[PDB]
């Protein structure tokens, strides 16, 4: 019932479940935290910005890797108007045989890609599932830099 | 071990084990005292 809202002693003394709920919803309101100065505020915001950019780059790297690994980017290059892009494969134990058959695309059940990443990456000059892997590797390196 | 075994190795791992340990840690942390 203590020590969770480390940034707020008023919440940490709450004997109810409201402390847990308000601890989540006030975690990023740095200006309202206990023992707070402006320098610490700007420094924490700066570090949070770095972590956020790292998260964005990791998300993009994950999209690239999953298109390279479980997608049909190379097949889509040769026939972009008939082949439907694949986002990533599906492994869900709750599937029946009918669901597996219906979601089956090429070798495994997979989700069609509605993000338009296939067309975007094709336009900027990507033609191989090894070009996407290089992008994922580089973006994970950039995320490490930002962290 | 082929690459197609990775989903069956990772999806249960992440989607069940990570919730369990994360719940353990979060409950322990939010139920601490001083």
């Amino acid at each position: 019932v203590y020590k969770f809202p480390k940034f707020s002693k008023a919440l940490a003394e709450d004997p109810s479940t409201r402390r847990i709920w308000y601890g989540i919803a006030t975690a990023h309101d740095f200006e309202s935290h206990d023992a707070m100065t402006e320098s610490k505020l700007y420094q924490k915001i700066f570090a949070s910005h770095f972590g956020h950019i790292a998260i964005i780059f990791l998300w993009t790297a994950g999209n690239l890797f999953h298109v390279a690994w479980q997608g049909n980017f190379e097949a889509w290059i040769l026939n972009p108007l008939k082949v439907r892009p694949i986002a990533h494969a599906i492994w869900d134990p709750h599937f029946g045989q009918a669901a597996y058959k219906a979601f089956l695309k090429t070798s495994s059940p997979a989700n069609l890609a509605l993000s338009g990443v296939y067309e975007w990456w094709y336009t900027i000059g990507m033609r191989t599932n090894n070009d996407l892997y290089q992008g994922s590797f580089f973006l994970i390196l950039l995320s490490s830099l930002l962290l | 071990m082929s690459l197609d075994l990775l989903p069956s190795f990772f999806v249960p791992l992440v989607g069940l084990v990570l919730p369990l340990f994360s719940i353990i840690g979060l409950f322990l942390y939010i139920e601490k005292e001083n």
Partner: peptide, 30 residues
């Protein structure tokens, strides 16, 4: 089709990015 080595080293590099993330997470304090 990417190889096992390609996926494995990407997983290893992802682990390194994870240790860098907790270091940033712990440095942003409890």
């Amino acid at each position: 089709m990417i190889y096992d080595s390609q996926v494995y080293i990407a997983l290893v590099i992802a682990v390194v990015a994870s240790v860098l993330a907790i270091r940033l997470g712990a440095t942003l304090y409890n």
